[PDB]
Design a protein around this ligand. Sequence first.
Ligand code: MG
Ligand code: MG
Ligand code: MG
Ligand code: MG
Ligand code: MG
Ligand code: MG
Ligand code: MG
Ligand code: MG
Ligand code: MG
Ligand code: MG
Ligand code: MG
Ligand code: MG
Ligand code: MG
Ligand code: MG
Ligand code: MG
Ligand code: MG
Ligand code: MG
Ligand code: MG
Ligand code: MG
Ligand code: MG
Ligand code: MG
Ligand code: MG
Ligand code: MG
Ligand code: MG
Ligand code: MG
Ligand code: MG
Ligand code: MG
Ligand code: MG
Ligand code: MG
Ligand code: MG
Ligand code: MG
Ligand code: MG
Ligand code: MG
Ligand code: MG
Ligand code: MG
Ligand code: MG
Ligand code: MG
Ligand code: MG
Ligand code: MG
Ligand code: MG
Ligand code: MG
Ligand code: MG
Ligand code: MG
Ligand code: MG
Ligand code: MG
Ligand code: MG
Ligand code: MG
Ligand code: MG
Ligand code: MG
Ligand code: MG
Ligand code: MG
Ligand code: MG
Ligand code: MG
Ligand code: MG
Ligand code: MG
Ligand code: MG
Ligand code: MG
Ligand code: MG
Ligand code: MG
Ligand code: MG
Ligand code: MG
Ligand code: MG
Ligand code: MG
Ligand code: MG
Ligand code: MG
Ligand code: MG
Ligand code: MG
Ligand code: MG
Ligand code: MG
Ligand code: MG
Ligand code: MG
Ligand code: MG
Ligand code: MG
Ligand code: MG
Ligand code: MG
Ligand code: MG
Ligand code: MG
Ligand code: MG
Ligand code: MG
Ligand code: MG
Ligand code: MG
Ligand code: MG
Ligand code: MG
Ligand code: MG
Ligand code: MG
Ligand code: MG
Ligand code: MG
Ligand code: MG
Ligand code: MG
Ligand code: MG
Ligand code: MG
Ligand code: MG
Ligand code: MG
Ligand code: MG
Ligand code: MG
Ligand code: MG
Ligand code: MG
Ligand code: MG
Ligand code: MG
Ligand code: MG
Ligand code: MG
Ligand code: MG
Ligand code: MG
Ligand code: MG
Lengths: 159, 122, 240, 46, 95
Amino acid sequence: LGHRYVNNDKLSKRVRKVWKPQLFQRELYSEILDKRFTVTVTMRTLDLIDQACGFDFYILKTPKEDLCSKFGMDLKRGMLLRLARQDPQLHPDDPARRAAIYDRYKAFVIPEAEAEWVGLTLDEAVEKQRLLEEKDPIPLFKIFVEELLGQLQQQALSE
Amino acid sequence: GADRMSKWTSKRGPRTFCKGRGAKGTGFHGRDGKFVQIKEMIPELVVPELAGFKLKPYVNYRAPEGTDTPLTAKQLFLETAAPAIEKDFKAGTFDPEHLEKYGFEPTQEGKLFQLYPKNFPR
Amino acid sequence: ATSVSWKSRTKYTVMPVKMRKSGGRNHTGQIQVHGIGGGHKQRYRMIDFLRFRPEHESKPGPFEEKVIAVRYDPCRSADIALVAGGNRKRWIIATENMKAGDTVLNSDHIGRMAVAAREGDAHPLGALPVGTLINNVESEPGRGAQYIRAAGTCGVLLRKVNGTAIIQLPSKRQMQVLETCIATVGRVSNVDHNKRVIGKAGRNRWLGKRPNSGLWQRKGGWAGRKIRPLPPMKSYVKLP
Amino acid sequence: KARGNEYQPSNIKRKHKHGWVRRLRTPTGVQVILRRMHKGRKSLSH
Amino acid sequence: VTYFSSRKGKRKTVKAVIYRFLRLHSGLWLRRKAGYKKKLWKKTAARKRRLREFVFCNKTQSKLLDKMTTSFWKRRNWYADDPYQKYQDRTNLKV
RNA sequence: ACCAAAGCUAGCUCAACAUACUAAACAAAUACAAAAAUACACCAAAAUAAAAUAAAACAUUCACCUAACAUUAAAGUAUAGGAGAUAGAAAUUUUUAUCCUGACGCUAUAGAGAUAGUACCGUAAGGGAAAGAUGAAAGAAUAAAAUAAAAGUAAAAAAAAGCAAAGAUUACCCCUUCUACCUUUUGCAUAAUGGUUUAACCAGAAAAAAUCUAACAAAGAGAACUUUAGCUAGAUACCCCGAAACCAGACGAGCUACCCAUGAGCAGUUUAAAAGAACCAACUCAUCUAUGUGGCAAAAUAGUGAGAAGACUUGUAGGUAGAGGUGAAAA
RNA sequence: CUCGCACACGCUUACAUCAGUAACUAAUAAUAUACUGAUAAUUAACAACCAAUAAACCAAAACAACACUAAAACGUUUAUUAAUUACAUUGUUAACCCAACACAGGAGUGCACCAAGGAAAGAUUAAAAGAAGUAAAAGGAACUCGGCAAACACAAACCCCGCCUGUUUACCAAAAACAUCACCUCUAGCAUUACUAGUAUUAGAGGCAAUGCCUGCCCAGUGACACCAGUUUAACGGCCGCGGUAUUCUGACCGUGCAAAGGUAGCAUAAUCACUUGUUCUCCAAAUAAGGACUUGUAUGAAUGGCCACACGAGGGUUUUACUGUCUCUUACUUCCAAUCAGUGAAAUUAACCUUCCCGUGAAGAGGCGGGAAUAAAAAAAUAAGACGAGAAGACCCUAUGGAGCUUUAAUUAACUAUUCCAAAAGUUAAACAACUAACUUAACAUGGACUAGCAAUUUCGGUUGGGGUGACC
Ligand SMILES: [Mg+2]
Ligand SMILES: [Mg+2]
Ligand SMILES: [Mg+2]
Ligand SMILES: [Mg+2]
Ligand SMILES: [Mg+2]
Ligand SMILES: [Mg+2]
Ligand SMILES: [Mg+2]
Ligand SMILES: [Mg+2]
Ligand SMILES: [Mg+2]
Ligand SMILES: [Mg+2]
Ligand SMILES: [Mg+2]
Ligand SMILES: [Mg+2]
Ligand SMILES: [Mg+2]
Ligand SMILES: [Mg+2]
Ligand SMILES: [Mg+2]
Ligand SMILES: [Mg+2]
Ligand SMILES: [Mg+2]
Ligand SMILES: [Mg+2]
Ligand SMILES: [Mg+2]
Ligand SMILES: [Mg+2]
Ligand SMILES: [Mg+2]
Ligand SMILES: [Mg+2]
Ligand SMILES: [Mg+2]
Ligand SMILES: [Mg+2]
Ligand SMILES: [Mg+2]
Ligand SMILES: [Mg+2]
Ligand SMILES: [Mg+2]
Ligand SMILES: [Mg+2]
Ligand SMILES: [Mg+2]
Ligand SMILES: [Mg+2]
Ligand SMILES: [Mg+2]
Ligand SMILES: [Mg+2]
Ligand SMILES: [Mg+2]
Ligand SMILES: [Mg+2]
Ligand SMILES: [Mg+2]
Ligand SMILES: [Mg+2]
Ligand SMILES: [Mg+2]
Ligand SMILES: [Mg+2]
Ligand SMILES: [Mg+2]
Ligand SMILES: [Mg+2]
Ligand SMILES: [Mg+2]
Ligand SMILES: [Mg+2]
Ligand SMILES: [Mg+2]
Ligand SMILES: [Mg+2]
Ligand SMILES: [Mg+2]
Ligand SMILES: [Mg+2]
Ligand SMILES: [Mg+2]
Ligand SMILES: [Mg+2]
Ligand SMILES: [Mg+2]
Ligand SMILES: [Mg+2]
Ligand SMILES: [Mg+2]
Ligand SMILES: [Mg+2]
Ligand SMILES: [Mg+2]
Ligand SMILES: [Mg+2]
Ligand SMILES: [Mg+2]
Ligand SMILES: [Mg+2]
Ligand SMILES: [Mg+2]
Ligand SMILES: [Mg+2]
Ligand SMILES: [Mg+2]
Ligand SMILES: [Mg+2]
Ligand SMILES: [Mg+2]
Ligand SMILES: [Mg+2]
Ligand SMILES: [Mg+2]
Ligand SMILES: [Mg+2]
Ligand SMILES: [Mg+2]
Ligand SMILES: [Mg+2]
Ligand SMILES: [Mg+2]
Ligand SMILES: [Mg+2]
Ligand SMILES: [Mg+2]
Ligand SMILES: [Mg+2]
Ligand SMILES: [Mg+2]
Ligand SMILES: [Mg+2]
Ligand SMILES: [Mg+2]
Ligand SMILES: [Mg+2]
Ligand SMILES: [Mg+2]
Ligand SMILES: [Mg+2]
Ligand SMILES: [Mg+2]
Ligand SMILES: [Mg+2]
Ligand SMILES: [Mg+2]
Ligand SMILES: [Mg+2]
Ligand SMILES: [Mg+2]
Ligand SMILES: [Mg+2]
Ligand SMILES: [Mg+2]
Ligand SMILES: [Mg+2]
Ligand SMILES: [Mg+2]
Ligand SMILES: [Mg+2]
Ligand SMILES: [Mg+2]
Ligand SMILES: [Mg+2]
Ligand SMILES: [Mg+2]
Ligand SMILES: [Mg+2]
Ligand SMILES: [Mg+2]
Ligand SMILES: [Mg+2]
Ligand SMILES: [Mg+2]
Ligand SMILES: [Mg+2]
Ligand SMILES: [Mg+2]
Ligand SMILES: [Mg+2]
Ligand SMILES: [Mg+2]
Ligand SMILES: [Mg+2]
Ligand SMILES: [Mg+2]
Ligand SMILES: [Mg+2]
Ligand SMILES: [Mg+2]
Ligand SMILES: [Mg+2]
Ligand SMILES: [Mg+2]
Ligand SMILES: [Mg+2]
């Protein structure tokens, strides 16, 4: 979003102008997730995929800032999880293909605690952490019973 | 300029506006358009027989007050579960798995008056 | 705000269904079309524009229907006919001489010998003689009639070439279609609708037409008598 | 002809145009309520 | 002229002055003649010379240019090789 | 002698600190038409700020203008600009804790709008007030105590003649002499402007060069600079109210324009007729005149008129929104 | 004397009973539906709230027999399931609402025209002027812009313009303006939100104004189609001269110039630049009026329509009758105002006033200056010549490097909407041709850069001038 001078003479009218990317419908194949997604991409995306030599490469090999998509970060979170888990459900019938594929991507393998937090919005993160911390408050009967057993076992051991 | 401040009440609008004053619904609309009451929604007052019992609305003036101790979950634990738990631990019959004999309830959904979602008005 | 169109009713009914006029306003509420509103109140009769419609998918063959009544319709210029066969009735657009207590044939069948054409008969174009008068013309086969439904209008079949029919629309433009498309044989009802004389401004209001504007506009370049060579022929035949 | 009687009261119209629900159904309406809250109005809406 | 700038709150200089004049340190300002590059074929040799001169501004103009210019442009400069260093001081002026 | 007058408090303002930053209060009820316990769904969203203004016009441009990085300098320098108005860096430099928090700030036309976002005014967004004064005690009102001073009146109407006074005079007048005041203008008693009167409020602000006074002086400044008597410090300076507009975003179709739904009216007479026929009520209009003209009325009253089964009148609910809408065009 | 009772909508206790009213509300009292306090009150049978899904039904309301055209609101039954069980909840006052007021205004429906509702006058007096009415001798439009208003009249004719009913500037214009039946041009070959659940006898964009007789000539310019040729005037718009001729004024004829065509039919001193009160006839005792003719109108004229005509018109003009206080020429009497008494009690306005007349003077029209005249002081009632009287920082006029609206052949040009093209994107073909890589393709979206238009956006109207403008100048 910006402005331009008409004719490029600085002395002409100054005019608001917006330059929009040319978008395409293309279906891409992910090896690790074993799937064909129909995605809107640019010619630039295709050139970066070409340059990084694979779709899955391009997704793993690029930082959060450079993809810019929440969907890119979710693709990445997914296949990062599939790599850290070594998920058998990738190719159930052929462990040959499975090891073969998990092989080339071994550079990006990261631990599990890390891999599920990669593509997350602050919202999604806060939610997730709230769910892990979800506990029904412990009945005071329990706590009072444990204090009482402490006291009774120290009354029994003192004599 | 109409009226902004005065509250919005069934007296104020057209015929089509009926807003209760906050009494609770006793039923539903039936087939004939006539209204049907559900005997279960109508609160049944539970009133004890007062005749043979001695207590009065007021208290004698020379009668003493007392030191004020708000009941706490702890005191209630000690007047009830503590003697029983102590009796059965001293006898070694104590079972950390089932506390139900002492009056603890694992879940509320079985019993008639439940405490936490609070099934009863009063 | 947002208004919902009255045009939602899923099941077909011969019974008149109630409709809401909207004078010229789109669903946003602004005026789109000027000069429309507040005529007489009208119910709408659903018209089946697919003339060949086998009642059950069990028996596909060409079938025959009886004309029960021919009624005035408020919604369109042509007069319409109530037509019953098997267990079902439907409204169809009546041909000029169609009268009550009549018989009308609906057929998809072609054949080498063509057909002697009656009025209410519906046939595939391929099955008709080459000089015939037709109305309620399909575009693609199975689509339903669009062209030539107005009162007293008739097109004419011009020729048949390469498993395809070429017909002449009432605007005197030529139209090329597969010969498997259905058409009804004859001129549409109520031929004198042209010569009707609206007597007074009031009648125009009854028809739901609001008066023209009062603003004076100087005529522009667009006006004059333009004599344009008749446009090239429309073809809905999709070449491989 | 004679003017000043422009206001012809209806409760339905009143509450449909200016009411609480109407103010909360759009972002702009919510900003109205917010402004009035800010100024500390006794009556936020009709 | 901006007497109090926005960011700094100081007093700006008008650059259009700095491009066409030269301030000696005495307070004299020096300028080129007007139209000295213009239409030379049409002019006398004498007139051409009168144009090629560097000339001094009268008092009024000098005060004006001073006001349009900040303090920095009035400092004593020592340039290496400077043509005008000869002219910065005033001598034998009895006033 | 009335009307009146006088208080010193309520609170405020500006900073400092500070933890850290949506107060208080929640029993029920609250997003049906908020404050209405209880039935099968939907739910949600983003697009550069613009212009007034400066350039003595206006067309590129026009600091600040709801985006953390301060401070001493570099520096109003490099640069950028209808090379005009104006705009304007950086490299590089400097910055010593914590306590000593208060006031050459206001005192009821001030200070917050605030006793209050209340009354009241708007359909709404929104606008938005005024107001207090006894004493230790009024559980001291045949009540006791200190101003009686604004205009306005009363106590007390006036007595030839004249900008209302002044010279005077034994004496109020009588005599004599003077064409209100501001502003604005070549020039105003002007019959040119403004003001009933009283009280309280109500309008000149900046330190480049200069002058004046003083320090120290070939140097001066508590760092950064300036210097061929200079440098450093102080003191001397540049108003108030007012357009029609322009731009952004909200709020408005309960009036009215046109629609959509849904209701309701039209008696008598004349006619084969409910025919945008006829006569004439209810009803709807608003022709001509007279009243009225701060009115009964911010468009009415009295008479008189035009239509009156229609392109008719009319109730209720809904729609279209300002770069727009609507329009049987009257902008 | 007659706007009554109820409901809806709205209002929100203003209602009811008892008591009080020094003062507060009532534009004044008495007292109280409206001020104050205390205490009470509208009770459901009326009204609100008050099932879904399938399926059969083409057949108007109009006293509905049967029909008309503009084709029309309003439900039965059958099947499948629908908690089954006294009493639920809510509206119930009023003299009321919208108009700043206890406002002669605005307010839907059902029944009534009285059985229900109400009071034009606080008390006097009986001046003017003003308002509203009734009556009027003789005359009967002589009034006047006009028979405006009024009338014991409530009739006839003729023009202009619009065909007609209708619409419009709420609050200075109701019309000759607009619309309109009719007639004409343009633009469209089509599907689930408009047009339209339509399909060229249809639908949009317009012009003009029914009917009748008509609608002449022009495609050079400007548009618009045809992306160029060429076509279009019921598209924007146009439709001429000079000289010589019949004995004489004229000019059938002749010459010649220029044009895209050279104003045809009709009508005509007109609602038609001026000349104009053209000329003549009719009407009147008398007419710049009205009507009829003549008519170059060198500035009429044919769908930005031309000419006749029926009916219609609160349109604009003219005649006749009749009628009359319009008038000659006014008069009498009632009511409201009025004046006096009692109660309550506003507004614009206001430098200060101890506020005369004449002639002179003077910022060029003096209560106030000069020269003269006049002159006890005060109310109340009347008149409007002056106070350049009051009202509103003149709407006329000019100025301002002040605005805004509108129109374009002004200068700069976006977005958007359509067109056309190149690139992007998806593809497809030959293994191309001659002898000893290119070319072509494109469904809907859709990007970047151009093109042509539509719809628009931003901004401006140089100064001097014996006021501006025109002219002239700089
Ligand atoms: Mg209000
Ligand atoms: Mg109600
Ligand atoms: Mg009610
Ligand atoms: Mg019941
Ligand atoms: Mg229709
Ligand atoms: Mg029809
Ligand atoms: Mg039309
Ligand atoms: Mg028109
Ligand atoms: Mg109002
Ligand atoms: Mg400017
Ligand atoms: Mg200025
Ligand atoms: Mg300007
Ligand atoms: Mg800006
Ligand atoms: Mg440049
Ligand atoms: Mg300039
Ligand atoms: Mg205050
Ligand atoms: Mg205040
Ligand atoms: Mg006094
Ligand atoms: Mg004297
Ligand atoms: Mg003058
Ligand atoms: Mg002067
Ligand atoms: Mg003088
Ligand atoms: Mg004068
Ligand atoms: Mg005077
Ligand atoms: Mg004067
Ligand atoms: Mg004056
Ligand atoms: Mg004066
Ligand atoms: Mg002045
Ligand atoms: Mg003046
Ligand atoms: Mg003044
Ligand atoms: Mg004055
Ligand atoms: Mg200085
Ligand atoms: Mg000074
Ligand atoms: Mg501007
Ligand atoms: Mg401007
Ligand atoms: Mg409405
Ligand atoms: Mg009738
Ligand atoms: Mg009629
Ligand atoms: Mg009237
Ligand atoms: Mg009368
Ligand atoms: Mg009448
Ligand atoms: Mg009538
Ligand atoms: Mg009539
Ligand atoms: Mg509405
Ligand atoms: Mg504008
Ligand atoms: Mg508009
Ligand atoms: Mg209208
Ligand atoms: Mg007009
Ligand atoms: Mg106009
Ligand atoms: Mg009220
Ligand atoms: Mg009472
Ligand atoms: Mg009273
Ligand atoms: Mg009642
Ligand atoms: Mg009286
Ligand atoms: Mg009298
Ligand atoms: Mg009289
Ligand atoms: Mg009489
Ligand atoms: Mg007489
Ligand atoms: Mg006369
Ligand atoms: Mg006369
Ligand atoms: Mg009359
Ligand atoms: Mg008469
Ligand atoms: Mg008569
Ligand atoms: Mg007419
Ligand atoms: Mg008017
Ligand atoms: Mg009207
Ligand atoms: Mg009229
Ligand atoms: Mg009028
Ligand atoms: Mg017309
Ligand atoms: Mg014709
Ligand atoms: Mg005609
Ligand atoms: Mg013609
Ligand atoms: Mg042409
Ligand atoms: Mg041509
Ligand atoms: Mg003639
Ligand atoms: Mg003339
Ligand atoms: Mg002409
Ligand atoms: Mg024309
Ligand atoms: Mg003409
Ligand atoms: Mg007729
Ligand atoms: Mg007439
Ligand atoms: Mg009429
Ligand atoms: Mg008329
Ligand atoms: Mg008499
Ligand atoms: Mg009196
Ligand atoms: Mg006197
Ligand atoms: Mg004089
Ligand atoms: Mg004298
Ligand atoms: Mg004198
Ligand atoms: Mg007078
Ligand atoms: Mg006068
Ligand atoms: Mg005056
Ligand atoms: Mg003025
Ligand atoms: Mg004027
Ligand atoms: Mg003017
Ligand atoms: Mg100027
Ligand atoms: Mg200007
Ligand atoms: Mg141009
Ligand atoms: Mg601009
Ligand atoms: Mg000019
Ligand atoms: Mg000038
Ligand atoms: Mg002049
Ligand atoms: Mg002059
Ligand atoms: Mg000129």
